[PDB]
């Protein structure tokens, strides 16, 4: 009984973020499929204790 | 410092309704605004920090919006558990200042009170004071007239009532009216509690005979 | 600035991204520059939101069905999907690489422009030990220390005390 | 997740010095900024912040009277409010100030709050009376000072249908509280005891409520 | 004797980011632009529930195959779901002319 | 530099992007540094042209026609168009965001490197009031003022006059 | 720094990207700063590799065949190919333009941060002639010259000799 904007054969995704790596075949207003394992964007500074 | 002006002061909406609480800063505070939920007799729970960012474990029905001065907390589909006082807090500069508060109560279908009457225990009677207690149990709305009677005689300014906070499951209230003797109590026989509520067709009377 | 001349960062400084550590007769401790930390967050939030919000995607069903005598257009459909995959994986990855460089460069600028505001106010009254520190040749009380922090420092009234030291 | 626990006098006389202690377990007292927040009636007011190393900050409307300290050995955080009046009668909260993030600095973990009354009036133990009896039965926690009183049923076993009421300030300047519980009338043949704790007078009493 | 120092934040964050000039740079704070999580459920799209067919495919459902009797089509759906067990189609052998085209046109009603 | 230490810009300076305001006995007024303004334009024109000219588009007819029994390849055509739409809207938008940052950073560099050429020539002869200005401790005539502007300033002949002031 | 204040580069400096030219009684010559050259290469190699390696391409056969009655889907196939062509030519070209700017800016930073380490250690003992050079007011032997290079220079022991000069 869940609600979604993007549907995938293995399960619904709810974001937000511009990119996904769940599944290439998607139905709806979906994030663009990429082959990346991570797309981490630094916000803080270089951590040197 | 910065004055946080909150609107509304009180709010009453049904389950499924959209609720909007507006906070205003006396100067531009960028996006350094937090929203807290304070349940009765508890410490405030953080719902939204940084004007719009949602706290981990908080239902997505809660949402924040705004920048500068005008800020908005939104409960998209109100739930019986959402009964609380909601607070906005700026953290742009010191001192940190909170909003005055917004109390949200849950609107539901009319429920008539269960009326109970309690005579003063023969233990209390041994010290020169008698307290007759009337209980209105699990009712909505909160408002009810509770009038005391010793014969047919209506009682004036020797009674005090206390109401429970709205039940976080079925959105009902409980009211306890207390009539405080001993020489005056031993004088009279019948002790009636007249209950006027919008759910009842006519006033309900629960009484006892002394003995 | 970051790992440049100022060797490391402080785990002791708890309440901000950039700030100051002072030491005098009244005491010592870390104090976060709130104003510069707040701006840094406000600009980087704008960066994070810009990368996120500018992606406005159309309603699309990626899935298609073709029979045993439609393999050519099936492979055309695959070429379209694999084409978008390669374009997006490459652009998204490089965007991250380029923005992370700019973000860490941005933090370097803020730490440097904070050192070059303290140095810019003090001159002769304190010696640059390096490592981001200024050893005062005079008595700098908590008001003197706070006057540097907000940028309302009075130079001449300590220079004569600094000259003998 | 970290625990914070407020401890204090509960009752302090006018012009005296209020001393409160935040006992922290789960994290080090030396690693974080710690804040005091009080609510009178009125909304929330931020007292100030303190850190081991260092440089505290207090609200300009309180600066002259407030002092904060950290005990590293007992892992404790203290507040000292001097020359107190009736305006200082509030529920005092100790909260942790989380390290800078993208948020960045926000109160997430709070204590459960401690009530402090400013009055020359003396401490008084309550007299507990049974309210004899679906059937309703209760306990009347009568004539006490100051707030609060904790009431439980069957040593905390009975939770279902329990209604502990907010206290009422009587003509004497003392407090009266009622606590009721609705049980099946078939289940009275099954002991019902109310446990009453009033901390400042050191009054601990249990009471069997029988029909 | 009196000193003032300029510095920057450090914590015990082990989050690493990659820049164009440097790999595995440990940072104090970060955000993930990639979504790598799903609820593992076939949900309602646009607020409208999907048409699930179970042991039947579109051919079996639309023609009214005897094995597709215990199936009720709603007034509307956002998408059609077939399973790996959707083997019930044309029980009498033959060609369903423009089957895929009908499937595409029935996908959302 | 821009909104950094130099508070605001001059509406009075009419004929250039960066320049100088002087004040002496002979008079006062705004004078635009033509050479640095000209380079700035020449580099930014190259930036604008590079974003424009590098787009070399093929002759294409986007429009296609498919009958009532060709909805699958019609939707494949839509996926191709909506795919290019999303790629181009996203890349064009971010390119603008990233280039505008670089352009405003470029202007900041030019204003800073102009201040740090005047400061670099003067040293002791003028005090840094901040706000981008230099209060001369000596008589600086229109030739002296122009000698700083073109970068042919003579330091030692005013230092003794500056020392007493 | 590059073509900024330091006029030109040295063909004489053979073994590094950035370095020093000294001159004293013991002799003269070019010496490359190995540590800063090594880092510069290590960072730019990472840049070159990042642009190269992040391209992970799918196995695809671009070629398709359509008969005389399939011109519409033939032109759809051409639109897909010409679409990818335009996207890739534009992105690849601009990426090169933007990265070359950043690389030449990176080299400028390294040359500047090397000058502002020598200047940062010397102060009064040598005069800035400009052009990237420091004319010592005292005897700076090969050990003195090497003490500046590695960043372990002793300032006070030459200042008195520099004061008279
Ligand atoms: C529909 O249901 C199933 C398909 O899953 C059919 O049952 C099998 O049919 C196959 C022929 O394809 C036989 O080889 C098997 O022996 C059957 N039993 C199995 C595999 O469970 C069934 O015949 C279909 N019926 C209709 C009316 O369409």
Author numbering:
A (entry chain A): 284 to 332
B (entry chain L): 1 to 180, 182 to 212
C (entry chain B), F (entry chain B), G (entry chain B): 5 to 169
D (entry chain H): 1 to 40, 42 to 134, 143 to 198, 200 to 221
E (entry chain A): 10 to 118
Authors' account:
Haemagglutinin (HA) of IAV is an envelope glycoprotein that is responsible for receptor attachment and membrane fusion, leading to virus invasion. We previously reported a VH4-4-encoded mAb isolated from a volunteer who had received the A(H1N1)09pdm vaccine; the mAb, named 3E1, can target the HA stem region. In this work, we demonstrate that 3E1 exhibited broad neutralizing activity against H1 and H5 subtype viruses in vitro and protected mice against H1N1 and H5N6 viruses in vivo by inhibiting the low pH-induced HA conformational rearrangement, hence blocking membrane fusion. The crystal structures of 3E1 Fab in complex with the HA protein of two H1N1 strains showed that both the heavy and light chains of 3E1 recognized a conserved epitope comprising the C-terminus of the fusion peptide, part of the F subdomain and the C-terminus of the outermost β-strand preceding helix A. Our structural and biological data suggest the potential of 3E1 as a therapeutic drug against H1 and H5 subtype viruses.
To elucidate the structural basis of the broad neutralizing activity of 3E1 against group 1 IAVs, we determined the crystal structures of 3E1 Fab in complex with the HA ectodomain of two H1N1 strains, namely A/California/04/2009 (CA09) and A/Washington/05/2011 (WA11), at 2.9 and 3.1 Å resolution, respectively. CA09 and WA11 are two pandemic and reassorted group 1 IAVs, which differ by eight residues in their HA extracellular domains. Like the HA proteins of most IAVs, the HA of WA11 exists as a stable trimer in solution. There is one Fab-HA complex in the asymmetric unit, and three Fab–HA complexes related by 3-fold crystallographic symmetry form a trimer. Additionally, we were able to build two sugar residues at Asn97 and one sugar residue at Asn286 of CA09 HA, and two sugar residues at Asn97 of WA11 HA. A comparison of the structures of the two complexes did not reveal notable differences in the overall structure, indicating that the introduction of the disulfide bond in the CA09 HA trimer has no effect on the overall conformation of the HA trimer. To investigate this possibility, we constructed a series of mutations in WA11 HA and measured the relative binding affinities of these mutants with 3E1. The biochemical data consistently show that the I45F mutation abolished the binding with 3E1. Apparently, the H18Q mutation in HA1 abolished the binding with 3E1, explaining why 3E1 did not bind to the H9 subtype viruses. Consistently, on introduction of this glycosylation site in WA11 HA, the mutant also abolished the binding with 3E1.
